[PDB]
């Protein structure tokens, strides 16, 4: 009964007419907790988490409904709560704005009661930068009686002029190549074709792993087996472009290994999530970022709800990404591949533009 899955029963105390600082979405036949808003009883108890779901609230089933009756139920009950759930699978940094913003005109915000309008020249407490596209914040001089938090756009520092310079690729120390884009628009096939049709002109970066040494991969041919203590020490030092736990072990990618590959006359290839760029630019690798994007819905459905969400996610990675230096519109595959080879061969006989910092 009640799904018969890994079930937990939790208790949270709620008064009358008091929001509980949780954001509930509505996707396929189930209700999903989406955010935890600080300063609310949910954060105080520190029990609920994002990604979970709901079965029944105070003994009344939930699955099979929309959000509005859930809202009506929660806005009419007080006292001790009873929730049924299955589990999931910082420090203040005062800032000062330099523009204007007003949520009621922005058709993009992931809620409408957490806007937090503010004029130019204010001061903000920022509490969490966890979701790197929407920060949680408090306006200075109003801290206590908000009472909850607010959301503010996560524009990274972007100037209104810079200083660029010409740069010529040397004879035999070639710049990396770094592909980014949405999750399901054929990056992997492109990588495999590039590494298979041409075999002696590309390479890769061997990662770090804290697993056990199986009897198929020896010393430095496929991994860099180490002890976990060194791994957390390196994370603290900040030597990792990207790192993520998986299966009780740790993976990643270093910065020395990329130098080993780039230091012998080959073109490194990679693939990244949109998070890591901030760490990559500040170093001196001198990357070259390429954005692979899908075309409109009609031709894509020709190629192969899910279409709409993929177009939407494509939209998000632009309008707050301005680093990269070229966009490839995916099409007939063996035309995008030709375009990619054209671009990469172009670098050898045509100088390029880099911010002048990377040379001083």
């Amino acid at each position: 009964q009640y799904g018969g899955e890994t079930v937990k029963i939790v208790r949270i105390e709620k008064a009358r007419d008091i929001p509980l600082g949780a954001t509930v979405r509505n996707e396929m036949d189930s209700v999903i907790i989406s955010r935890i808003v600080k300063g609310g009883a949910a954060e105080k108890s520190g029990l609920l988490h994002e990604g979970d779901e709901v079965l029944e609230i105070n003994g009344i089933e939930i699955r099979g409904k929309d959000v509005n009756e859930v809202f009506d139920l929660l806005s009419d009950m007080h006292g001790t709560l009873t929730f049924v759930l299955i589990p999931s699978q910082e420090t203040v940094i005062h800032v000062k704005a330099h523009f204007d913003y007003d949520p009621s005109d922005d058709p993009y915000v992931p809620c409408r009661e957490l806007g937090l309008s503010f004029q130019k020249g204010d001061i903000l407490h920022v509490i969490s930068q966890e979701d790197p596209n929407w920060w949680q914040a408090y306006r200075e001089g109003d801290e206590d009686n908000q009472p909850l938090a607010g959301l503010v756009p996560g524009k990274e520092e972007i100037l209104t002029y810079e200083e660029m310079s010409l740069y010529h690729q040397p004879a035999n120390r070639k710049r990396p190549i770094i592909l980014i884009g949405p999750q399901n628009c054929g990056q992997n096939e492109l990588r495999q074709r590039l590494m298979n049709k041409e075999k002696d002109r590309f390479a890769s970066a061997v990662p770090h792993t804290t697993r056990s040494r199986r009897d198929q991969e020896v010393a430095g041919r496929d991994y860099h087996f180490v002890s976990r203590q060194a791994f957390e020490a390196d994370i603290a030092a900040g030597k990792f472009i990207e790192h993520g736990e998986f299966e009780k072990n740790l993976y990643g990618t270093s910065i020395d290994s990329v130098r080993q590959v780039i230091n012998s006359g080959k073109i490194c290839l990679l693939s990244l999530r949109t998070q890591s760029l901030k760490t990559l630019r500040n170093s001196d690798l001198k990357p070259y970022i390429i954005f692979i994007a899908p075309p409109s819905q009609e031709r894509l459905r020709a190629l192969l709800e899910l279409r709409e969400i993929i177009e939407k996610t494509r939209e998000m990675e632009q309008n707050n990404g301005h680093y990269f230096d070229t966009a490839i519109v995916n099409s007939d595959l063996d035309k995008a591949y030709q375009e990619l080879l054209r671009l990469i061969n172009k670098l050898d006989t045509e100088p390029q533009w880099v911010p002048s910092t990377w040379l001083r």
Binding site: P19, T23, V24, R25, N26, N68, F71, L74, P110
Partner: peptide
């Protein structure tokens, strides 16, 4: 216009 965006409980 993804969905009705969200809701605060």
């Amino acid at each position: 216009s993804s969905r009705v965006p969200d809701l605060l409980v």
